With several copies, the nearest count.
Chain A
Amino acid sequence: TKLKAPAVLAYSRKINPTNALMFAVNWSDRDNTTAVMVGTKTVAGTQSVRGNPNDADKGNIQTVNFANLPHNKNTLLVKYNVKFVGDVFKAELGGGEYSNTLQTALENTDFGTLAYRYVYNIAAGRTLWRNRVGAESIETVITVNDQTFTFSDLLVNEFDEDVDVAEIADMVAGVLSGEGFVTLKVEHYMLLGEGSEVFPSQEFVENSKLSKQLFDLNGQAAMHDQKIGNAIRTIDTWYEDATTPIAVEPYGSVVRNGVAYRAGNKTDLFTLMDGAVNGKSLTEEDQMFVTANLIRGGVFGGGK
């Protein structure tokens, strides 16, 4: 009767970013780059914890990683690549019937908009996260298919119209809508000032020697591929009471803040996917949300 979902339905991710390496340059001398190295320092502080005042007179010594621009370079340079891949509907472990009728129900999905918002998050430098705070200007250089595009200061929380973002979203939507691949080589330049703190990815480790460990590749500050990924796929402006774009998540999850904007309101990925497969009609943006979840990849479990 009802076409139910497999026990596990799995898709691979289709936006594949690399690690972001962090160099230091001068804004008007971008061909003399030097790597930003992770260092270690002592940090003494107080016990300023909301709970207990009875131990605020004691201190706490700590040691942490830190990363800074040198005192003779004013510009942070962040480098990475992003590979977009097609065949966004070939399941990796899910069955045949459910996945194929879903591929059929979603072939009319607005891929131009998804490609635009991906490329736009890349070009405006949302992937730079806290490295955006306090920048004089941000300049993004994207090299794709022997073409070089330059982007100056761009509004991140609005997907404002730009002819070059659209010109790259052309090829990106062409690959996503069909098959093949396309690789963008991305550079970011931020004018922060000589000696400014940069913000590499923070490590999630049980390490008693450090209170804060920054991600490093042979000592050089870097950012996790998965964090750049979480930045790029932040395109969801379609949940109820929508304010700012959030990352494509099956439950609209922002565990960061302790809320999920798609929990228990008929608008989660599984409700909408069961709808799409079982004959129901989908909004253009519900189609976009479900297909963006497929682009995200995942191992969606539960069912029979």
Chain B
Amino acid sequence: MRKFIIVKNVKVDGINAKSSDITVGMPPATTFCGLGETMSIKTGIVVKAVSYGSVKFEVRGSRFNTSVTKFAWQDRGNGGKANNNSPIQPKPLADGVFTLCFEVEWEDCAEVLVDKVTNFINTARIAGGTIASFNKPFVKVAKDAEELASVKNAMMPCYVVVDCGVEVNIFEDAVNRKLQPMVNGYKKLEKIVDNKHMRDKFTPAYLATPTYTMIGYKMVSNVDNFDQALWQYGENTKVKTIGGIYND
């Protein structure tokens, strides 16, 4: 039919809050889709889509400047310099509390699914952040669009992310539409020739640059079509919602 598993109040400490060179804050949908796919690889459960919501969130630092992290020495040929503060790249970190909902292909009993999900989460991070504590995951199911609303409100309370597309461009839309940019995918700039230095020796490699959309945050309740708030991979190496652009 349609099965989901919800994990509420995922306290995460130490998030890599830089999603791109011009976006620092809430981890983007690409991150949670990658998390769902990591779980798919590690457990075998097929993950159709994911929906995430912020319960608490704070970037470290002040209002207009993010915190610095103290870089520790790490590279060879630096012993003649390890007696002084290591030079330093920017790496804003954050701390938060999220609620997750994964749509899954499951035919078995709920206890097995929940235990496999918990045993995966115990080995994961979220956007690099250490997972400190999460509630017991629970399963729900929906046949018609009425039970989908119950699955939706089961995440309460949290602010989930809807995709409202780009009219002009990121900057003009931020100024005029009072919305928030978000990394939604990537654009391939050039193929990388040699995998001498890559995570794989075989997987195709490309230099890329992020592609964005314009998102909005809304209380899972006030969202009508829950599909409009479920993110998954897809066309043209982007990610998007099952229900498309948000306007009910």
Are B76's CB and A301's CB within 8 A? Answer: yes
> Which of A99-107, A145-153, A158-166, A247-255 makes up part of the contact surface?
A247-255
Check A303 for interface membership: any CB of B closer than 8 A. Answer: yes
Q: Which of A6, A17, A213, A249 is the one whose CB lies under 8 Å from B72?
A: A249
Q: A218-B58, A255-B85 are in contact. Are A301 and B75 (CB under 8 A)?
A: yes
List, in ascending order, chain B residues with CB within 8 A of A253's CB.
72-73, 82-83, 86
Are B130's CB and A83's CB within 8 A? Answer: yes
The interface size bin for chain B is 35 or more
Check A156 for interface membership: any CB of B closer than 8 A. Answer: no
Are B123's CB and A85's CB within 8 A? Answer: yes
Are B199's CB and A93's CB within 8 A? Answer: yes
Q: A81-B132, A204-B70, A251-B73 are in contact. Are A19 and B62 (CB under 8 A)?
A: no
Per-position 1/0 for B9-22, Cβ under 8 A of A: 00101100000000
Check A43 for interface membership: any CB of B closer than 8 A. Answer: no
Are A209's CB and B62's CB within 8 A? Answer: yes
Cα–Cα distance between A250 and B11 once the two chains are bound (Å) = 31
Cα–Cα distance between A5 and B197 once the two chains are bound (Å) = 12
Are A270's CB and B66's CB within 8 A? Answer: no
* Chain B minimum-CB-distance residue to A96: B201
Cα–Cα distance between A262 and B82 once the two chains are bound (Å) = 9
Check B176 for interface membership: any CB of A closer than 8 A. Answer: no
Most chain B beta-carbon neighbours within 10 Å: one of A5, A224, A249, A253:
A253
Per-position 1/0 for B201-217, Cβ under 8 A of A: 00000000000000000
Per-position 1/0 for A80-108, Cβ under 8 A of B: 01010100000001000000000000000
Are B67's CB and A204's CB within 8 A? Answer: yes
Q: A8-B197, A19-B95, A204-B70 are in contact. Are A251 and B79 (CB under 8 A)?
A: yes
Minimum Cβ distance to chain A for residue B196 (Å): 8
Check A18 for interface membership: any CB of B closer than 8 A. Answer: yes
Cα–Cα distance between A83 and B65 once the two chains are bound (Å) = 31
Per-position 1/0 for B58-74, Cβ under 8 A of A: 10111001111110111
Per-position 1/0 for A1-45, Cβ under 8 A of B: 000011110000000111100000000000000000000000000
Per-position 1/0 for A212-246, Cβ under 8 A of B: 01010110000011100000000000000000000
Q: A251-B82, A255-B84 are in contact. Are A213 and B62 (CB under 8 A)?
A: yes
Are A251's CB and B78's CB within 8 A? Answer: yes
List, in ascending order, chain B residues with CB within 8 A of A224's CB.
60
Check A195 for interface membership: any CB of B closer than 8 A. Answer: no
B-contacting residues, A251-304, CB 8 Å: 251-253, 255, 258-260, 262-264, 268, 270, 298-304
Minimum Cβ distance to chain A for residue B103 (Å): 27
Minimum Cβ distance to chain B for residue A269 (Å): 9
Check A205 for interface membership: any CB of B closer than 8 A. Answer: yes
* Chain B minimum-CB-distance residue to A201: B60
Are A298's CB and B61's CB within 8 A? Answer: no
Q: Which of A17, A213, A225, A302 is the one whose CB lies under 8 Å from B76?
A: A302
Check A181 for interface membership: any CB of B closer than 8 A. Answer: yes
Cα–Cα distance between A258 and B81 once the two chains are bound (Å) = 10
Minimum Cβ distance to chain A for residue B91 (Å): 11
Check B56 for interface membership: any CB of A closer than 8 A. Answer: yes
Q: A7-B197, A218-B58, A264-B80 are in contact. Are A205 and B66 (CB under 8 A)?
A: yes
Check A203 for interface membership: any CB of B closer than 8 A. Answer: yes
Cα–Cα distance between A244 and B132 once the two chains are bound (Å) = 31
B-contacting residues, A167-220, CB 8 Å: 181, 203-207, 209-210, 213, 215, 217-218
List of 8 A-B pairs having minimum Cβ-Cβ separation, nearest first: A302-B76, A251-B82, A207-B62, A260-B82, A18-B132, A263-B79, A204-B68, A301-B75
Write the residues of chain B forming the contact surface with A, with a CB cutoff of 8 angstroms: 11, 13-14, 56, 58, 60-62, 65-70, 72-80, 82-86, 95, 122-123, 130, 132-133, 196-197, 199
Q: A93-B199, A251-B78, A300-B76 are in contact. List 8 more A-B contacts (CB 8 A).
A: A7-B197, A207-B65, A225-B130, A253-B72, A255-B85, A258-B84, A262-B79, A303-B76
12 cross-chain CB contacts under 8 A: A5-B76, A204-B68, A207-B61, A207-B62, A226-B14, A250-B74, A253-B72, A255-B83, A255-B85, A258-B84, A301-B75, A302-B76
